[PDB]
Amino acid sequence: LIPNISPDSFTVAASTGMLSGKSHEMLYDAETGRKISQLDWKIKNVAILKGDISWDPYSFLTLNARGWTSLASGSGNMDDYDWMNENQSEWTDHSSHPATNVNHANEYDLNVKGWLLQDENYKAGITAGYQETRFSWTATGGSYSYNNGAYTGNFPKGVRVIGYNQRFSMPYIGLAGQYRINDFELNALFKFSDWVRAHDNDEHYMRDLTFREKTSGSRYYGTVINAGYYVTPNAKVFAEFTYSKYDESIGGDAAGISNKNYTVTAGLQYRF
């Protein structure tokens, strides 16, 4: 009839589905703030597995460890722009790499929720935690247009051109809500940080160059929304939507590292 929820109980959930998104790897002129270089790294439809464990030691407190990982290499894309001419608003260089692999992607998130409002149908509270997210790509082959289109050509097919990975880590705060009627349950989380630490590594294999960038104190917004049905008092089948935005050798004013991503998964949660 309704969910069976005991004190000091805990849940385990697993879901499966898809990751998409877009990262930007940026280079600015530290003197003028003018954008010099931008590579757009896409994640097209990577298969992922998500796990979630919750424990309610008290009626007002939940402890939560969750995370996801790509299951294998996935489909991506990369576009690389330079603005080599200050006297021009349009980029002078564009290289395209449709054959870009997403080598891996993962995330984990350790947190607590403190429930401030609670009744028969509604729960609302504050959350805080620590989260890290990682992405890795390799762009291969592709084509290049340089000097406003006067140099054009192709990279050797299948050959690695640029390797790139990002890591975002942050403590965060947020608001958590729940709505239940009968056997339907809706959860919504909103997360925020002004304390994001970003790192990336870029290997330009054909230039014998490696770039490292690091930023600090950038902004993050995220949401987790899941809607489910208890097929039994202890077992919930659910769909989950997720959205994350990490705002923006190489340091300080020169560096820019960002990402947007979303996940759509479905699975099962069980309460012990």
UniProtKB/Swiss-Prot annotation:
Q: How does activity depend on pH?
A: Optimum pH is 6-7 for plasminogen cleavage.
- Organism field: Yersinia pestis
The record's comment about this protein's domains reads: Forms a narrow, elliptical 10-stranded beta barrel with the active site pairs on the extracellular surface.
Regulation of its function: Requires bacterial lipopolysaccharide (LPS) for activation; addition of LPS to inactive protein reactivates it. In the absence of LPS the active site groove is slightly narrower, and peptide substrate binds deep within the active site groove, displacing the nucleophilic water molecule.
Know the name of this protein?
Plasminogen activator
Q: Where in the cell is it found?
A: Cell outer membrane
Question: What gene does this protein come from?
Answer: pla
Q: Which family does it belong to?
A: Belongs to the peptidase A26 family.
Q: Which residues lie on this side of the membrane: Periplasmic?
A: 1-7, 57-60, 117-121, 181-183, 232-234
The answer, when asked if Chloroplast is one of the entry's keywords, is no
Membrane topology type, per the record?
Multi-pass membrane protein
Q: What keywords are assigned to this protein?
A: Aspartyl protease, Cell outer membrane, Hydrolase, Membrane, Plasmid, Protease, Signal, Transmembrane, Transmembrane beta strand, Virulence
